[PDB]
């Protein structure tokens, strides 16, 4: 009870999973060389070709 940090393995697993998921979801905002980071504005501003 008194001494914490004795359950490191489960916390590490949860932290790794959460951090990987957060990195994946944050990657969605990258420009990737285009002119905008959102496809809706690309459809609403350009011409197909």
């Amino acid at each position: 009870s008194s001494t914490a940090s004795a359950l490191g393995k489960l916390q590490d697993v949860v932290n790794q999973n959460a951090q990987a998921l957060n990195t994946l979801v944050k990657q969605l905002s990258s420009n990737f060389g285009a002119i905008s980071s959102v496809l809706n504005d690309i459809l609403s501003r350009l011409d197909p070709p």
């Binding site: 002119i35 609403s44 501003r45 350009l46 011409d47």
Partner: protein, 49 residues
């Protein structure tokens, strides 16, 4: 209009423009536009010109 060395720069803001009538005029020798399609110019809303 002044020369190329003294190009005249002007600010356009706080107005409701209408580019359709400007586009439909046939007096323009050349009309090529980048990044925005001329047809969709009547829907986007900008900050200043």
């Amino acid at each position: 209009f002044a020369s190329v060395y003294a190009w005249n720069r002007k600010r356009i803001s706080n107005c409701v423009a209408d580019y359709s009538v400007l586009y439909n005029s046939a007096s323009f020798s050349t009309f090529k536009c980048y990044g925005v399609s001329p047809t969709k110019l009547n829907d986007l809303c900008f900050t200043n010109v």
